[PDB]
Amino acid sequence: IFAKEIDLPRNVIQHSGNKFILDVVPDSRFPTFAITEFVQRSFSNFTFEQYSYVSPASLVGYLVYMIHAFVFLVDAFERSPMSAYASEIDASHAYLRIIDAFSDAYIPDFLFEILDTYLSHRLDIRSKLEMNVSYGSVLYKYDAPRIVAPSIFLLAHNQLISQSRESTAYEKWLDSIVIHYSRAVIRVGNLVGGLYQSTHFTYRNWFARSLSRLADSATHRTHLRRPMISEFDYNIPSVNNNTYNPYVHLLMLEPNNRNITLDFIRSLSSFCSTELKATRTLRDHISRRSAAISRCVIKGPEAPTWHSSPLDDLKEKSKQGNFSQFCEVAKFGLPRKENSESYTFKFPKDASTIDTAFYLIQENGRSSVLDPTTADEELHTEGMNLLFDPYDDESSAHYATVLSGKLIQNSNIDGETLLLPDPTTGLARTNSRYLQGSVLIRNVLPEFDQHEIRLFPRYPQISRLSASLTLLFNMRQVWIPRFKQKVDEQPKLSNFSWNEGCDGTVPSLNVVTAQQVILWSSYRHVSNSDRPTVDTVYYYSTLELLFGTRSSMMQTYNLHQLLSLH
Amino acid sequence: SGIFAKEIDLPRNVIQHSGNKFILDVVPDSRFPTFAITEFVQRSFSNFTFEQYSYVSPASLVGYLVYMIHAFVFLVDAFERSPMSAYASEIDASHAYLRIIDAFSDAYIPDFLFEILDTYLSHRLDIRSKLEMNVSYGSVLYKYDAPRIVAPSIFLLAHNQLISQSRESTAYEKWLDSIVIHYSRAVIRVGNLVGGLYQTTHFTYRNWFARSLSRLADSATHRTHLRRPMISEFDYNIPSVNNNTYNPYVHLLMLEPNNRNITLDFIRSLSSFCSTELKATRTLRDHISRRSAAISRCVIKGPEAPTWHSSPLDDLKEKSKQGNFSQFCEVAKFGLPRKENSESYTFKFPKDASTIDTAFYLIQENGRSSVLDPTTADEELHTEGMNLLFDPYDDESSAHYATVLSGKLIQNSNIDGETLLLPDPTTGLARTNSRYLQGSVLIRNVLPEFDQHEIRLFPRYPQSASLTLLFNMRQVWIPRFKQKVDEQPKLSNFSWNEGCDGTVPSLNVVTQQVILWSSYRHVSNSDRPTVDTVYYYSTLELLFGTRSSMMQTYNLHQLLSL
Amino acid sequence: TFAITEFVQRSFSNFTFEQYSYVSPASLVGYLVYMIHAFVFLVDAFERSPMSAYASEIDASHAYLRIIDAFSDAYIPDFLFEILDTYLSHRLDIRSKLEMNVSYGSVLYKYDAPRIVAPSIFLLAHNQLISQSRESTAYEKWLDSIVIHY
Amino acid sequence: RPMISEFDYNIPSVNNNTYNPYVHLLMLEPNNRNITLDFIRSLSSFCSTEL
Amino acid sequence: MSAYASEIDASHAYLRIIDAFSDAYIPDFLFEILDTYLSHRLDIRSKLEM
Amino acid sequence: IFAKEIDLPRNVIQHSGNKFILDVVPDSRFP
């Protein structure tokens, strides 16, 4: 009736938002686990006599290699613009020969079940928000054990051949140096979490129990039943913060490794083609597009499968260790430290000269009840996962989600605040609210540095009603009022939530504005096109500020409780 | 379908729970449908026609069409909401008022009003398969919602004023004098609810709602019916309620025990007019069970000036004078400046300042003052503001034609942030999937609009922005330290609100400071609405997401302009 | 209630039924106790001639029609009809105007309160099975739970 | 293994003039109307699916 | 409507004359003139009316 | 080529003008 009079399609302001690239970095421990179990159940059907490099370790390293190769091809040929890590790889003829080698290398149909979840995606209404997979946000002390280096499996190939009749033959593999990171010898036992010291000890977690089968030389007579055999002469690179490129390290593109890398790629591509009946490549697959990248696994506090402690060379035979002595070395779930009492606050001698409710220094009254969660095996190895899906509530589509490695691992964040729309501002700024559920990683504790992890618990959700928190006039900071001497009325101290008894050993505040936050996320954002720094990378603690609470949430087990080792 | 699909077998190793049952109420601001209906009547009703009907006026026809919206809300509440609200339980629908309820269930309505009613249809979310949005007035408190739910009896009073000529006052001014209800000991009038008559002299200011409603009692229409008498007087009786006896379905649908003849005759007499002269063929009965996702579309707006005030009015004996916007906003208590410090309380402070650590003491040396200033009443800023258009499913501006007319709105004046509870994988999936009250404010903290409170508009921050809460989102910790601590704590991580004297907000965290009205609500129990059981949704983006479509448009009085 | 608890303790393992947010042994016992009292209300309000004063006080036509229709169409296991078949109305043969039927329209609280097991007790047990208290068990905090202020 | 949610049940307060067993046993207080309907539907679905 | 047309009352005498010249018969010649006085709204300037 | 990248139907401001009534008063000497 009033359609032509109001004429609202000709009387609106529309803006679809600014351009925003959302980076996805998969935790490669989970596809490595699936690939190792794939090779376990299929390798005896293969003929490897015409190959001097093919072993189970080499085949697992090839498939993990082709995952990282897919990531480089998406970041270099599909992301606009390409990341600063991929721009450092020169387009010279040697690099182009290796890129053409893994662009036409044959991949089995199993690995595309994982790789179809890494396809790019652009939202419908947010038509300038893009999700794509790239390692352009990767720092080594933040992401090193969650990104499985394929050079570990060449060393496992070297140990799988050796004619030794020792009991646990995978322990020389755990000694093998992978990289030098500026002053630091990082071994396989640092990245897989199977060898520590306090005398060397072996801890067999779910990742090392799976990978130890590839480097155990008790079955070396099966792998030596061939005319000609060779070993990988892998050269250990020395990098620092200024020269670390994850694509050069993961794709083995150092100048003293490019011939071995090329022979590795072509030998195992021919092996997959002739024996695994692999017919497909990555070249016709990096331009595909699907909404499966927005599915992720939400985890709580889990124990590491790594530690950053420096290991010496294994001279003797290693003993068997346990969970608690590993978590003391890995610095996970430590108790609350003791008050050293090095600083002293200035409390007045007369107590009637101040209003003591307005003075933040006690008379040594109440102590804190904040205690960290000590490392327990049932809590931190058997915790349940959540399956996130923004578009459909089907559990058959999370088969590839539990294998892929897209995850948000949240330990202590309980709330994220959304900026409410202002109808008086410009609509570009209103429709460009993209960094809402994100934390800048200046505040995020690194996992592969020598830091301590104390798990102060999230509040129990066993209340009777739902809770929320609303911020007035400014959400960017929480006000603490400072009063003048003569005020209008009595200030009521009922809205002040006190954190009684702080002594440097408990959290004093619970607000991170724009060391303290324990978070890893697959979903990231870099604020520029330069080298990723700690001031430019954001970890997304959730995607529900973007996709809503109307999205599907399903609860499941861990992958090692779902995929058995046989 | 996967090498490991049979081994892992996710359909037997996942837990699935859609969440618990949760009903989200929708209370439409019926000023905007009234603004549409008045414009429909002023183009369909000439003063040179329709002279043979005794109860049909522009005023009575607008009142009928406003009545049928509230009738639709009652029918959806009483017959489709599971269970009905306490306000609909108090109606004797089975015996005493069955004739009236059947009268407006079979009353004929023009096809214009179903453009508004198609937006009020019930809706259940897809993945949230136990979250039901439906329209209901079972959350309505009078001092929160009275001027925003336009009472149909106002237009019955306008019809009654169009009959005779008073001493020295116009039909519009005598219509603004007309008492609507006696709420407690107060006398609520049309000039309170429409906002066209304030104060020992009386003044008149036609704001955008009163300027449209003025056409139902203007001088030409009043001169038509004095010089051509046909129209009869409704014998309507004025209700007298309080907090324990108020019911919006009694007041809006005229269901008092002494108004039962009047209401039935009104419904039947204007149903006959709409079926004869307005080609109406459709009723409400087949329409209350229909479902659509149109109820989730809304209009977000910032601080706007009220088209009401709650000051007591005396009887207008003289002729009123001309008023303006600033003098009306002083009476409506909108956009008041910063209050003066009365200095009625004095804190302690040491004569020797080097006995305490001043940076950890919340009382100054009378130093830096607060730079928080309220935004005062500006006509261009508070009447001509821009609106947003929320739609969580589509991206079409043609679909928002009906949501500007519907009145489904969120009017946020000072809230800048809402915190989402993140999912805990170690709790129950029912509790994780039942995060429904995120983005709600309990109305114990919300400033009432039709009580006689004062609205000072401290501004939101000018527009990334992010805030992360650790270990507990329910409260923001303020640390109180031991004397001997491990290391010196960092003072630079504190945000100080300096110079708080009781005239500026001391805190920004709400665990009445909140200035909010929302159409989207939730009631905790099946009882009468209290201030401790009603929530106002300041947003819907915790539920639907920032991937929802947001457009930007003008006010309805700038689209349907005069 | 003693029969229903034994039916639930054999039909509900702690190793199963982990995807439901409101289902417990406690809540299931409370549901099955609720449906007995629901049957008594329906017989009183729709079959006793006339209904009792307690059933006259329920706004069955408008306000509580959704709830009454919810438990009239609620699904009940076949175990509970073994008890409900004994509660059916009966008129004597030669005493053709003496009607026996089930009704709570004679219930005084100080006479009949512990013998009519309130379903909200089991709702309180469900609520106590969620969190851990200071120094008391879930059973003892369930015994502390207030049912009503009479 | 947290999945179970909390019923937000409100405790009734009656006397001799206001006691009704069909209100107390069937949870028909004005503030318990959401809780009762969700309880009945949520356990009817469980009995129809798993029992 | 303009302020000049709003001053004409909708009483029965005025409505009788308005109904008289609303149903008065007009020859086909005068519609050749009156067809040029029809209203018009521009296409792109969709809120300019003549 | 750059149609989906620029996406100019989703990156413009459009306004068709305000309401304006243009009155025509014929010189009746000619009819």
Tab-separated table of N, CA, C and O in Angstrom, chain B residues 501-547:
chain	number	residue	atom	x	y	z
B	501	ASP	N	32.061	12.289	41.312
B	501	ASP	CA	31.463	13.049	42.399
B	501	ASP	C	29.994	12.731	42.635
B	501	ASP	O	29.324	13.485	43.345
B	502	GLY	N	29.479	11.652	42.062
B	502	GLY	CA	28.080	11.312	42.187
B	502	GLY	C	27.189	11.870	41.105
B	502	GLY	O	25.989	11.579	41.107
B	503	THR	N	27.731	12.665	40.188
B	503	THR	CA	26.975	13.235	39.087
B	503	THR	C	27.363	12.631	37.748
B	503	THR	O	26.708	12.906	36.741
B	504	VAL	N	28.414	11.816	37.720
B	504	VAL	CA	28.787	11.031	36.545
B	504	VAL	C	28.746	9.560	36.911
B	504	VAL	O	28.790	9.200	38.095
B	505	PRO	N	28.606	8.669	35.909
B	505	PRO	CA	28.693	7.234	36.217
B	505	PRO	C	30.068	6.795	36.696
B	505	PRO	O	31.076	7.019	36.023
B	506	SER	N	30.110	6.169	37.868
B	506	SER	CA	31.361	5.720	38.459
B	506	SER	C	31.864	4.423	37.849
B	506	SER	O	33.078	4.224	37.747
B	507	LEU	N	30.965	3.543	37.437
B	507	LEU	CA	31.320	2.278	36.826
B	507	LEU	C	30.677	2.176	35.454
B	507	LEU	O	29.761	2.929	35.118
B	508	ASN	N	31.160	1.230	34.662
B	508	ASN	CA	30.600	0.972	33.346
B	508	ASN	C	30.126	-0.467	33.213
B	508	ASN	O	29.764	-0.916	32.127
B	509	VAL	N	30.123	-1.195	34.319
B	509	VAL	CA	29.847	-2.621	34.324
B	509	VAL	C	28.557	-2.858	35.084
B	509	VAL	O	28.420	-2.428	36.234
B	510	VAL	N	27.612	-3.528	34.439
B	510	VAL	CA	26.376	-3.964	35.067
B	510	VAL	C	26.409	-5.484	35.124
B	510	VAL	O	26.414	-6.151	34.085
B	511	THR	N	26.431	-6.027	36.336
B	511	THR	CA	26.612	-7.457	36.561
B	511	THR	C	25.371	-8.268	36.215
B	511	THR	O	25.443	-9.232	35.453
B	512	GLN	N	19.121	3.132	38.520
B	512	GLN	CA	19.060	2.466	37.226
B	512	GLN	C	19.992	3.142	36.234
B	512	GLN	O	19.822	4.313	35.918
B	513	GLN	N	20.974	2.397	35.737
B	513	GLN	CA	21.985	2.953	34.850
B	513	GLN	C	21.692	2.728	33.377
B	513	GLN	O	22.141	3.515	32.542
B	514	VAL	N	20.957	1.678	33.041
B	514	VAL	CA	20.777	1.285	31.652
B	514	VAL	C	19.582	2.021	31.068
B	514	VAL	O	18.479	1.983	31.622
B	515	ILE	N	19.802	2.701	29.946
B	515	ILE	CA	18.720	3.343	29.217
B	515	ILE	C	18.459	2.517	27.968
B	515	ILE	O	19.203	2.601	26.987
B	516	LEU	N	17.409	1.707	28.005
B	516	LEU	CA	17.110	0.746	26.959
B	516	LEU	C	15.612	0.509	26.909
B	516	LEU	O	14.958	0.419	27.948
B	517	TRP	N	15.068	0.425	25.703
B	517	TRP	CA	13.782	-0.217	25.486
B	517	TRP	C	13.997	-1.230	24.380
B	517	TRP	O	14.683	-0.939	23.396
B	518	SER	N	13.421	-2.409	24.537
B	518	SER	CA	13.516	-3.447	23.531
B	518	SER	C	12.158	-4.091	23.348
B	518	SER	O	11.374	-4.202	24.290
B	519	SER	N	11.883	-4.504	22.123
B	519	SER	CA	10.705	-5.302	21.844
B	519	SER	C	10.907	-6.771	22.182
B	519	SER	O	9.931	-7.462	22.469
B	520	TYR	N	12.148	-7.243	22.205
B	520	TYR	CA	12.470	-8.653	22.372
B	520	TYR	C	12.787	-8.935	23.837
B	520	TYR	O	13.742	-8.380	24.384
B	521	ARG	N	11.987	-9.795	24.472
B	521	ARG	CA	11.995	-9.935	25.922
B	521	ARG	C	11.956	-11.399	26.324
B	521	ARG	O	11.701	-12.288	25.510
B	522	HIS	N	12.193	-11.639	27.611
B	522	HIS	CA	12.035	-12.958	28.204
B	522	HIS	C	11.572	-12.836	29.645
B	522	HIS	O	12.097	-12.022	30.405
B	523	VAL	N	10.593	-13.660	30.011
B	523	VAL	CA	10.053	-13.722	31.364
B	523	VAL	C	10.515	-15.029	31.992
B	523	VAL	O	10.462	-16.082	31.348
B	524	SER	N	10.966	-14.962	33.246
B	524	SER	CA	11.575	-16.127	33.880
B	524	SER	C	10.537	-17.170	34.273
B	524	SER	O	10.789	-18.373	34.148
B	525	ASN	N	9.375	-16.743	34.758
B	525	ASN	CA	8.360	-17.699	35.179
B	525	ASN	C	7.017	-17.453	34.509
B	525	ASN	O	6.903	-16.612	33.616
B	526	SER	N	5.995	-18.193	34.933
B	526	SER	CA	4.649	-18.063	34.397
B	526	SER	C	3.777	-17.166	35.261
B	526	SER	O	2.550	-17.264	35.209
B	527	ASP	N	4.385	-16.295	36.050
B	527	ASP	CA	3.663	-15.468	36.994
B	527	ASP	C	3.518	-14.062	36.406
B	527	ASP	O	3.830	-13.822	35.237
B	528	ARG	N	2.992	-13.141	37.208
B	528	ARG	CA	2.915	-11.736	36.839
B	528	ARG	C	4.314	-11.173	36.613
B	528	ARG	O	5.261	-11.588	37.287
B	529	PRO	N	4.479	-10.255	35.666
B	529	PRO	CA	5.799	-9.670	35.423
B	529	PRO	C	6.286	-8.806	36.568
B	529	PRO	O	5.583	-7.900	37.019
B	530	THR	N	7.480	-9.090	37.058
B	530	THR	CA	8.140	-8.258	38.044
B	530	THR	C	9.397	-7.676	37.420
B	530	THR	O	9.791	-8.039	36.312
B	531	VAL	N	10.045	-6.771	38.153
B	531	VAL	CA	11.275	-6.163	37.655
B	531	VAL	C	12.460	-7.099	37.815
B	531	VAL	O	13.523	-6.852	37.234
B	532	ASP	N	12.299	-8.187	38.568
B	532	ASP	CA	13.336	-9.181	38.773
B	532	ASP	C	13.170	-10.403	37.886
B	532	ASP	O	13.953	-11.347	38.007
B	533	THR	N	12.167	-10.421	37.009
B	533	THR	CA	11.923	-11.564	36.144
B	533	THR	C	11.789	-11.229	34.665
B	533	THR	O	11.453	-12.121	33.887
B	534	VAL	N	12.039	-9.991	34.249
B	534	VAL	CA	11.884	-9.587	32.857
B	534	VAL	C	13.223	-9.079	32.339
B	534	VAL	O	13.876	-8.249	32.979
B	535	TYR	N	13.625	-9.583	31.174
B	535	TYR	CA	14.891	-9.263	30.532
B	535	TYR	C	14.636	-8.497	29.244
B	535	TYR	O	13.661	-8.769	28.543
B	536	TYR	N	15.503	-7.538	28.925
B	536	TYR	CA	15.456	-6.835	27.646
B	536	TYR	C	16.684	-7.172	26.818
B	536	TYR	O	17.813	-6.909	27.241
B	537	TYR	N	16.462	-7.727	25.633
B	537	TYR	CA	17.538	-7.987	24.688
B	537	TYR	C	18.007	-6.698	24.030
B	537	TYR	O	17.293	-6.109	23.218
B	538	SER	N	19.221	-6.272	24.370
B	538	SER	CA	19.834	-5.109	23.749
B	538	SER	C	20.364	-5.391	22.353
B	538	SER	O	20.690	-4.445	21.633
B	539	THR	N	20.462	-6.658	21.964
B	539	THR	CA	20.883	-7.054	20.629
B	539	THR	C	20.390	-8.464	20.368
B	539	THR	O	19.925	-9.150	21.280
B	540	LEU	N	20.489	-8.883	19.111
B	540	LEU	CA	20.196	-10.250	18.717
B	540	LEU	C	21.371	-10.898	18.007
B	540	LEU	O	21.224	-11.981	17.434
B	541	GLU	N	22.536	-10.262	18.044
B	541	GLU	CA	23.692	-10.750	17.319
B	541	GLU	C	24.503	-11.768	18.096
B	541	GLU	O	25.420	-12.365	17.531
B	542	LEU	N	24.226	-11.965	19.382
B	542	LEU	CA	24.823	-13.114	20.045
B	542	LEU	C	24.129	-14.390	19.607
B	542	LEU	O	24.755	-15.450	19.520
B	543	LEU	N	22.843	-14.296	19.297
B	543	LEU	CA	22.088	-15.418	18.766
B	543	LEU	C	22.338	-15.647	17.288
B	543	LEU	O	22.579	-16.787	16.879
B	544	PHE	N	22.305	-14.599	16.476
B	544	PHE	CA	22.324	-14.803	15.035
B	544	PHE	C	23.698	-14.561	14.429
B	544	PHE	O	24.068	-15.217	13.452
B	545	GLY	N	24.453	-13.620	14.980
B	545	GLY	CA	25.798	-13.377	14.502
B	545	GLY	C	25.968	-12.031	13.840
B	545	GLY	O	24.986	-11.396	13.452
B	546	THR	N	27.212	-11.588	13.691
B	546	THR	CA	27.502	-10.412	12.884
B	546	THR	C	27.561	-10.722	11.398
B	546	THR	O	27.900	-9.836	10.614
B	547	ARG	N	27.244	-11.949	10.988
B	547	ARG	CA	27.058	-12.246	9.578
B	547	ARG	C	25.667	-11.872	9.099
B	547	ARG	O	25.382	-11.984	7.904
